[PDB]
Every structure is written in C-alpha cells, then in structure tokens.
Symmetry: C2
Subunit: 166 residues, 2 copies
C-alpha cells in the first residue's frame, strides 16, 4: 500500500489472530525495525508459545505477583499467533527512543502488509527467569514483546500547538 | 510511494529546503505523532527561526561553549524551513521514539523530509525558558521539516533472528 494509505483510520484495536505474518512478510517487519537509527529478535510461534507461557508464569511467580497477575502471565502468549521478543545489547535516553522508533516502524510494516502488532513490555521484562530464557547477559536487555497476527475488527493537535512568533 | 519501501529502503533524506509543510499537511504530521502524556508542539518558521536561533546561541554561550559550538547553535535553525519543538509533560522515553517515527513517516508520505535533532541544548535553562518549560516540562527535541534535497537498500535480519520454541 502507499505510504499515504498508512495514515488511515489507525484504529489499532486488540484481538490478533491467524494468519500470522510469515516468510518475507515477517522479514519485512524485522527489516523495518532495524532501519531507524539517526538488536536480537526471537520468533515465538506455535509450540514455542507454550514455553514462553511457562517462562512468563515462572517469572511472575518468582516476582511474588498475585494469582491474577500470574494467570495473566500464563495466558499472555496466546493473545496472538506470533510474538517477537526484542533484545538489545550511547546514553540512556538514546537507546530508549531508538527502541520506540524501531517498534513503531515494525507496527507500520505489519499494517502495510495487512497485519497488526501490539507492543508489550511490563516488569517481567526484567525478571531473571525471563531474561535467562532469552540468554540475556549483564549488558543485555529485553526491550519488549511484539504480538503479531491478523486483526479482528479524530485527534486534535490544536490544543497542543503554539507558534514561536518572535 | 510504497510504505514498505519507505520503511525498509528509507535512505535518510539529506538536507531540507523550501517548501515546508503548511496548513493541514503540518496538522497531518502533528496528528500522526499524537496517535501512538499530552505533547506540546511549537511551530518555528520564517521570523521565528531567527528568534529560535538567538535562543540556541545564547544557550551555547551560557554553557561556555567554544565558537565552533556557538556558531553551530546559531546556524542550526536555518538547515530547514520549518522546525517543530516537541515538549513532553512529565514506554519511558520510548513513547517519544514512537511519536517521532510516526511524524517522520507522515512527512515523508506527503513528499517532505523530517530530520530529528536533540542535543544538550534541549536541557539548557535558556532554551527551556524560551519555550516556557516548567518543572513538569521537558523539551524532547526538534523535528526539522522541508522538501528533501538528497536509493535502494535491504537489511538482513537473519543473523539477528532466532526461533524460540
């Protein structure tokens, strides 16, 4: 689709289902996340979701979370057919913003191809168990998890604009 | 053009010139930044760039910068016909990254180019006052906008991808 169309309704609602992007479609999303300067990706799908679920749940448990949070951790991976874990290896604010630039690009690449992506990154991102699951070293850091799949069904800047008249 | 080529084969725009986005085109860009804390946008153009230039230069001076740095600060606003100052009200600094990316794409989609700049001057008391920043306000940076003056490219994720399961 044309870049112009990418400025559509932007009604990114929840509920992502199959089909999940595959082959080049998925490669295109990853590529887009890469070109946004001015990263290690983990593909979680199918049976892999089971494992991820177990890891998140153990993470929540070790973190002393409550039943509801624990159950939410276990059920998380099944909210989309595909999940991409973004791990990073240059000030703080720099990487912080670069991460956001990359994530937004990935979500746009998914949309452009008829898919959708929901970004997630809670406290479990810092859980020793979860970090270990993705082989995170001391310097390594889990940025977050991008849920992908096929989606299932006006902003006013004016109140926020001022002119530097001079 | 193609959104995918725009995202993948971006080929960063080099140098911006007239015309700059105006009216709704600009509103379109700002609206894009709002869609994935309330941001405050400052529109700097024409005469405003000269005022912005004096503010930046003073900041460099107040910081005891050398002439090279002082010259760079004074000259900065003239590298594009339009500049948008993004002020946030204090997903951390990641939301900023998402908004700026969206705005750049919104500009590039309409044939414009957007170059993001920050620098230590966003922290300067002089610069913060010029934009009326309070203790709860933080200048995120400046988005330079104009018509790109200025090419294929395709990254390979493979060495950067591993299957979990």
């Amino acid at each position: 689709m044309d870049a112009l169309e990418l400025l559509i309704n932007r009604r990114s609602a929840s509920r992502l289902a199959e089909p999940a992007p595959t082959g080049e479609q998925l490669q295109n999303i990853l590529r887009a996340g890469m070109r946004a300067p001015d990263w290690h990706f983990f593909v979680i799908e199918g049976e892999g979701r089971e494992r991820f679920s177990a890891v998140l749940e153990q993470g929540a448990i070790a973190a002393g979370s409550d039943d509801k949070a624990i159950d939410k951790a276990r059920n998380a991976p099944f909210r989309a057919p595909l999940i991409i874990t973004v791990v990073a290896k240059v000030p703080r604010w720099e990487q912080e913003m670069s991460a956001g630039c990359a994530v937004m690009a990935m979500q746009m690449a998914a949309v452009a191809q008829g898919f959708g992506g929901i970004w997630r990154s809670g406290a479990l991102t810092e859980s020793p168990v979860v970090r270990e699951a993705f082989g995170c070293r001391e310097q390594d850091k889990i940025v977050g998890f991008l849920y992908l799949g096929t989606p299932q069904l006006v902003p006013d800047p004016t109140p926020f604009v001022t002119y530097f008249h001079h």
